[PDB]
Amino acid sequence: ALFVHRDTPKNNPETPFDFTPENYKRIEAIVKNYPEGHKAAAVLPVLDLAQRQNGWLPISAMNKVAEILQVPPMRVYEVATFYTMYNRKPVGKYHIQVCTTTPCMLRNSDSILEAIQKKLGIKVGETTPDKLFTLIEVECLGACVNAPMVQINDNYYEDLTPKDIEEIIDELKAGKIPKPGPRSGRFSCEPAGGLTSLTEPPKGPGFGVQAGL
Amino acid sequence: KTSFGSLKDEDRIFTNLYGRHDWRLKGAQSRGDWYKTKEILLKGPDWILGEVKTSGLRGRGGAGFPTGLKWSFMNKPSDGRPKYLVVNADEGEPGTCKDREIIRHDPHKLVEGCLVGGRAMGARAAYIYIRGEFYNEASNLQVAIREAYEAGLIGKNACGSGYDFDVFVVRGAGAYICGEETALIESIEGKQGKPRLKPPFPADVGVFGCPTTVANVETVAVSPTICRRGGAWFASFGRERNSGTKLFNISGHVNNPCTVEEEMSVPLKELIEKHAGGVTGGWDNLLAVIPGGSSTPLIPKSVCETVLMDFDALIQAQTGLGTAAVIVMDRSTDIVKAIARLIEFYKHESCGQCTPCREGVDWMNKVMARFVRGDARPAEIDSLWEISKQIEGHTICALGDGAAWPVQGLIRHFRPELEERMQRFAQQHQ
Amino acid sequence: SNLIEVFVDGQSVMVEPGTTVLQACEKVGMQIPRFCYHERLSVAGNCRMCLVEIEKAPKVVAACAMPVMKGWNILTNSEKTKKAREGVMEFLLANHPLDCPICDQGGECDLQDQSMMFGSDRSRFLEGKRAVEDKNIGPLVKTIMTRCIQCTRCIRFASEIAGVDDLGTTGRGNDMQVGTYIEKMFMSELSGNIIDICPVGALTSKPYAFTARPWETRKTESIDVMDAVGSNIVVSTRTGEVMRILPRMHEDINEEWISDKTR
Amino acid sequence: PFDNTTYKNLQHHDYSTYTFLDLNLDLSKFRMPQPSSGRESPRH
Ligand SMILES: NC(=O)C1=CN([C@@H]2O[C@H](COP(=O)(O)OP(=O)(O)OC[C@H]3O[C@@H](n4cnc5c(N)ncnc54)[C@H](O)[C@@H]3O)[C@@H](O)[C@H]2O)C=CC1
Ligand SMILES: Cc1cc2nc3c(=O)[nH]c(=O)nc-3n(C[C@H](O)[C@H](O)[C@H](O)COP(=O)(O)O)c2cc1C
Ligand code: SF4
Ligand code: SF4
Ligand code: SF4
Ligand code: FES
Ligand code: FES
Ligand SMILES: [K+]
């Protein structure tokens, strides 16, 4: 929760970090998306790439991103502390993010936060001792009609009950991967008691196209 | 036309909103996407801007600026710099989950919108700044962009029209402020997502210092349907200056929380009772509705009975249309706790750049955290009102406005509930 | 000429295109209050102290950044300009520490002075304040970052004039902190001028610390001899003893800076 | 046959941690040559 860095033996500028060569090819593809003379625009993806290789960002991933993009290291530190996805501390293998803003709080996200807490034996911000789960509490994840929902590392788990999130944590501990979707009967975002719209077949190419075109 | 709503399925722009059809290129072309795109591109920028101006399309991001007038700010000869369309796909607003559905289920509609809009504004390329939390949606959009490049629909000689146009996807990294257009531009440029002061507007100095139009996913993705069906078709829905269709996200205390496409000036009661299954406990169980996502002020049940869900009728209801994200709150809701959680959101999502938001949004969150418990006195209500008025209009971007407005709506419609909260705190703690 | 006509409080003034509202008011001898604007740094526009009413416009504009349009009547002393200044000063003083007796900036503090001139006379802030961890940027600049008002004159100086790029803002929101993010020592040849341009006592002189106080200092205008630049300085003395050395503005020599050897 | 009862977007169940960046690497060959500001960086 701090925004200064102190050198620890597991987080220092001599902590070993380097990209894999396939990650260097991915970095070249990232840098080619931006105009010549604006290589600094590749700070946010490549640093995120450094989080996808390592799981988190020690201050050698920040220094390596600053070195390969020829930007000052402070301008990478600003990005790494500004944005809430960059893990500047090592998180667990499954980073559970429970949304507790008002559309999820109205549909009882506190019960699911408590269910994760009493299932994993930890609280908000802590990590399980086997380094598998980090539970934090995030803002609106943009799945508001699928409230209450969580995010696990890339995946949204939606329309949750305490039983559903206990089942998801059970099959995360069992090595399997759960299905990223609503755990209720519906599929993505439709009304749960049947389609109130888009029941007709779509019309296809050419329908309603005006004259002179 | 006087009554609005009951939109037919043949008039839906966002068919395959629900993922029930193939989102890929065969399914998109079988639903009407990428049809006669070359004939749209060869009619020039002025024809496309005329169709968007005739359609009455306003900014679906939430402010409702006229889209054709906005996009015509780029209709000017080049000065050596390239021009850029930038598609705002951040969608950080609580309540709002519609652009996720457009990216996830109609991605080629967004890509064709990028092509048509960038042809209208003379843009070289499109940068779709997608939210970093929408990882599966971003990879979904990248598969559709690969299908559009491999079909020759974008890239070198896009749709066989002789117009070169790239479509890039930049992922965010977890900042709600990076959906504000200049903060989004700063986030694309590899910096902290801090908003720029306006002027310069992005059509003068935007991304990389180039001419730039930042436009929402929804106002971009409806533009090929506007160019095909006609602007007079799109202006036939909703009231005047309130034209078209709109995606609505009814969440909170309804029976069936859902995203649905609906005609523009639909009643809020008709929308909730028709597509969302009504309020939990009936319509008489309704306490309040945040009409357009978290930045719009709440309206109580007496306003929600007759109000129309477009821009002008919600401005007359002293709230905003916003992102058209209907957050429904029933009688069992601690409404001070919900608005204070919303102000807690706005202090966790505040980039810290200018003084009134950086200091006053945290100070409003502290006052609201005391108002939940009642640990306050009634003279601090009007004080808080003035604090909101010292943030509104005094900041760099409208996140300060969007944090002051829920406080103002809560005070304006629920001052007696705040007062009875504080006096019961005072009588059971003194 | 291509001068446009603008108005400051009804008074006409002819300005070059691209003149800001603040500079147009400066041409009639009115100094708009500011904290983040500095005429030798790039425009930031984030302290919001320079907010001023343009008439027939229902929104105050940031005068340091906003270019004037032809025919604007800038209302520097109107009611909503003064309310904007009082509100912004209230937010600046909400979390600011009660350190004026122990702070070296007292008496020569921009925050004190234009709190007296443009802010209210009392507080409505009934909460606890933030407290910021102090940084260590070297033996010259004492750092007390609770006093920081986040005007980013630090960062713009170190980036643009000193050419260093080691200062920045980490974090977000009210927890946004100006610093280096690491234990890093800001030792330029020009590193002492961030003591000058810090409007508050967040960056002070560590050798000058606690010794004197600006009202009792006699100001002797003199010349640097530490090099052949001839930087114009103020030697501030007190009771026959040299207390410190500040720059003088000479536009053709040292514009308003001095080297750390000089300082 | 017209189907409106199944969810056709089942591809993102199989996306890994490098799916977006491998798609960007695949798309790198389809793109136009970038414009240049004429200098290597604004600090050049
Ligand atoms: N969609 C979402 O996820 C969210 C949407 N919002 C909405 O954002 C809105 C505020 O957004 P802003 O862009 O900050 O405010 P808005 O006043 O400025 O501007 C909207 C658009 O119009 C353009 N524009 C406005 N006046 C102009 C002028 N004179 N010249 C040229 N261009 C001009 C701006 O460049 C911008 O692209 C609110 O209404 C809120 O509901 C807020 C938060 C989240
Ligand atoms: C704090 C803040 C966050 C915003 N977030 C978004 C967003 O996530 N998506 C979006 O489309 N617009 C967002 N906006 C509105 C944009 O600034 C801008 O008006 C819009 O993205 C593009 O204009 P348009 O509505 O014509 O498409 C936000 C505005 C503010 C002040
Ligand atoms: S009002 Fe808040 S969100 Fe906007 S520039 Fe200022 S600190 Fe940032
Ligand atoms: S910086 Fe100024 S206002 Fe703050 S404690 Fe020092 S003298 Fe007082
Ligand atoms: S330390 Fe001083 S100069 Fe630096 S940002 Fe803070 S108030 Fe401004
Ligand atoms: S409120 Fe939880 S996802 Fe939007
Ligand atoms: S002086 Fe213009 S905002 Fe700081
Ligand atoms: K100082």
Residue B271 and residue B5 in contact, taking contact as beta carbons nearer than 8 Å: yes
CB contact under 8 A, B350 and C127: no
Tokens of residue C188, six digits: 């330029």
**Nearest protein Cα to ligand 1, atom 26:** B65
Residue C116 in tokens? 């007296």
Which helix (H) or strand (E) segment holds residue C225: the answer is none
Say how far apart CA B290 and CA A180 lie, in whole Å: 29
Q: Which residue of C has its CA nearest to A4?
A: C181
Q: Do A107 and B97 touch (CB under 8 A)?
A: no
The helix (H) or strand (E) run that includes residue C162 is none
Calpha distance B136→D15 (Å, rounded): 7
* Ligand 3 atom at shortest distance from the alpha carbon of C173: 7
Verify whether the Cβ–Cβ distance B149 to D35 is below 8 Å: no
Q: How far is CA B35 from CA A156, B115, C24, in A?
A: 33, 13, 55
DSSP code string of B142-192: HHHHHHHHHTTSSBTTGGGSS--BEEEEEE--S-GGGGSHHHHHHHHTTS-
Question: CB atoms < 10 A from the CB of B393, how many?
Answer: 17
Backbone angles phi, psi at B3, to 5 degrees: -100, 145
* Gap between the Cα atoms of B354 and B396, Å rounded: 7
Report d(CA B17, CA A145) in Å as an integer: 14
Alpha carbons B264 and B247: distance in angstroms, whole number = 9
Interface-testing mutation among A31, A36, A156, with chain D (most D C-beta atoms within 10 A): A36
B335 φ, ψ to 5°? -75, -30
SS3 C222: strand
CB-based contact B127:A44 (threshold 8 Å): no
Contact B255/B280 with Cβ under 8 angstroms? yes
Neighbouring CB atoms inside 10 A of C215's CB total: 8
Instruction: Give me the sheet containing C242-247, strands edge to edge.
Output: C218-223, C232-237, C242-247
Domain boundaries, chain C: 1-212, 213-263
Looking at the CA of residue C154, tell me the nearest atom of ligand 5: 4
CA distances, C177 to each of B194, B249, C132, C134 (Å): 14, 37, 8, 10
Q: Please tell me chain A's helix, strand, coil percentages from 3-state DSSP, rounded to the nearest 5.
A: 35, 10, 55
Query: Which residues in chain D have their C atom more than 2.5 Å from the N of the next written residue, marking a break after them?
Result: none
Q: State if residue B401 touches ligand 2 by the CB under 6 angstroms criterion.
A: no
How would you label B313-349 residue by residue, b for 16+ Cβ within 10 Å and e otherwise? bbeebebbbbbbbbbbbbeebebbbbbbbbbbbbbbb
Could you tell me the CA-to-CA distances from B88 to A141, B170, B212, B264, D10 in Å, in that order?
16, 10, 12, 21, 25
- Give the residue numbers in A contacting D (CB under 8 Å), as ranges: 25-26, 28-30, 32-40, 45, 49, 52, 70-71, 153-154, 179-181, 187-188, 195, 199, 201
Give the CA count within 13 Å in the CB-facing half-sphere of B244.
30
| Contact indicator for A140, A103 with CB cutoff of 8 Å | yes
Separation of A145 CA from ligand 6 center, angstroms?
Answer: 8
Contact of A127 with A94, CB cutoff 8 Å: no
3 state DSSP class of A32: coil
Distance from CA of A166 to the nearest CA of B (A): 22
Q: Are C258 and C230 in contact, with CB atoms under 8 Å apart?
A: no
Q: Find, among C252, C138, C110, C150, the residue nearest to C205 by Cα.
A: C138
Residue D16 buriedness (CB in 10 A; 0-12 / 13-18 / 19+): exposed
Helix (H) or strand (E) holding A25: helix A21-31
Is residue B17 within 8 Å of B261, Cβ to Cβ? yes
Q: Which residue has the tokens 């590392």?
A: A153
The values of phi and psi at residue C208, to 5°, are -75, -10
> C148 and C213 in contact (C-beta within 8 Å)?
no
Q: Alpha carbon of B299 to those of B92, B189, B228, B288, B413: distances in Å?
A: 22, 39, 38, 6, 7
The DSSP result for A43-70, as a single string, is HHHHHHHHHHHHSS--TTHHHHHHHHTT
Q: What is each CA distance from C133 to A209, B275, B360, C200, in whole angstroms?
A: 64, 52, 21, 16
Residues with CB under 5 A from ligand 8 (ion): C 198, 203
β-pair partners for B258: B250
Report in angstroms the alpha-carbon separations of C9 from B353, C24, C65, C83: 30, 11, 19, 17
Give the residue ranges of DSSP H helices in D1-44. 19-27
List phi, psi (to 5°) of C116.
Answer: -65, -40
CA atoms within 13 A on the CB side of D24: 28
Asked whether the beta carbons of C32 and C52 are under 8 A apart, the reply is: yes
Q: How many CB atoms lie within 10 A of CB A16?
A: 6
Contacts of B301 (CB under 8 A, 6+ apart): B286, B287, B288, B289
Q: Could you give the angle at the alpha carbon of B76 between the alpha carbons of B219 and B217, nearest 5°?
A: 15
How many residues in total does chain D contain?
Answer: 44
CA B413-B418-B420 angle, to 5 degrees, is: 120
Task: Assess whether the C-beta atom of C44 lies below 6 angstroms from ligand 5.
Answer: no
Asked if B376 contacts B429 with a C-beta cutoff of 8 angstroms, the reply is no
CA torsion, points A173, A176, A179, A183, in degrees to nearest 10? -40
Q: Best of C31, C34, C155 to mutate for ligand 7, by most ligand atoms within 8 A of CB?
A: C34
Ligand nearest to the CA of B90: 2
Q: What phi and psi values does residue B209 have, to the nearest 5 degrees?
A: 80, 5
Do the chains contact at D30 and B104, CB–CB below 8 Å? no
Name the β-bridge partners of B166: B125
Residues 154-193 of A with CB under 8 A from B: 154-156, 180, 187-193
Asked if residue B115 lies in contact with residue B128, where contact means CB atoms within 8 angstroms, the answer is no
Of the candidates C162, B146, B70, the one whose C-alpha atom is nearest the C-alpha of residue A29 is B146
The answer to whether the CB of B355 falls within 8 A of the CB of C149 is yes
Rounded distance between C-alpha atoms, residue B396 and residue B33, angstroms: 39
Distance from CA of D11 to the nearest CA of A (A): 11
The CA distance from C157 to C164, in Å, is 9
Q: For the stretch C7-45, what's the b/e string if a residue is b when 16 or more beta carbons lie within 10 angstroms of its beta carbon?
A: bbeeeebebeeebbbbbbbbeeebebbbbbbbeebebbb
For residue B353, the chain C residue with the least C-alpha distance is: C46
Please choose, from the candidates B228, B230, B235, B256, the residue with its C-alpha nearest in 3D space to the C-alpha of residue B326: B256
Task: Give me the DSSP letters along B358-410.
Answer: HHHHHHHHHHHHHHHHT-S-THHHHHHHHHHHHHTTSSSSTHHHHHHHHHHHH
CA distance C65 to C49: 12
Distance between CA atoms of A196 and A199, rounded to whole angstroms?
Answer: 7
CB-based contacts of C239: which residues, under 8 Å, 6+ apart?
A: none
Measured distance CA(C43)–CA(C65) in Å, rounded: 6
Alpha-carbon span C14 to C4, nearest angstrom: 5
The number of angstroms, rounded, from the C-alpha of C201 to the middle of its chain's C-alpha atoms is 11
- Packing angle between helix A61-68 and helix A43-54, nearest 10 degrees? 140
Instruction: Assess contact for C230 and C253: CB atoms under 8 A.
Output: yes
- Experimentally, the structure was elucidated by cryo-EM
Closest CB from C165, C166, C171 relative to A3: C171
Q: How far apart are CA C8 and CA C63, in angstroms?
A: 12
SS3 call for C38? coil
Give the list of residues 6+ apart from residue C241 with CB closer than 8 angstroms, or none. Answer: none
State the Cα angle at B124 between B121 and B129, rounded to 5°. Answer: 90
Select from D3, D23, D35 the Cβ nearest to the Cβ of B142.
Answer: D23
Decide if A159 contacts A149 (C-beta within 8 A).
yes
User: For ligand 3, what atom is nearest to the CA of residue B350?
Assistant: 3
Does residue B202 contact residue B213 with C-beta atoms inside 8 Å? yes
Atom of ligand 3 nearest to the CA of B353: 7
| Amino acid letter, B418 | L
| Residue B318 DSSP symbol | T
Strand pairing report for B166-171 and C141-143: unpaired
Resolution in Å, one decimal, please.
2.3
Task: Give the DSSP letter of residue C130.
Answer: P
Q: Give the closest residue to B194 by CA, choosing from B363, B407, B357.
A: B357
B307: left (phi over 0), alpha (psi -120 to 50) or beta: beta
Cis peptide before B200 (omega within 30 of 0): yes
Which residues touch B1 (CB under 8 Å, ≥6 apart)?
none
Using alpha carbons, list the distances in angstroms from residue D4 to A212, B6, B20, B382: 34, 21, 5, 54
Q: What backbone torsions phi and psi does residue A150 show, to the nearest 5 degrees?
A: -130, 170
Helix orientation angle between B135-150 and B107-120, rounded to the nearest 10 degrees: 60
Nearest to D21 by CA among B331, A32, B69, C146: A32
The reply to whether ligand 6 has any atom less than 6 angstroms from the CB of A142 is yes
Q: Which has the closest alpha carbon to B256: B335, B308, B328, B322?
A: B328
Strand-pair partners of C51: C62
Q: What phi and psi, each to the nearest 5 degrees, are found at residue B146?
A: -65, -40
Contact criterion met (CB below 8 Å) for C152 and B192: no
Residues written for chain A: 213
| Torsion angle defined by CA atoms of residues B13, B16, B21 and B27, in that order, rounded to the nearest 10 degrees | 40
Q: Cβ(B172)–Cβ(B178) under 8 Å?
A: yes
For residue B268, give both structure tokens. 């809020």
CA-CA distance, B84 to B154, in Å (whole number)? 15
CA angle, B118 then B123 then B129, to 5°? 75
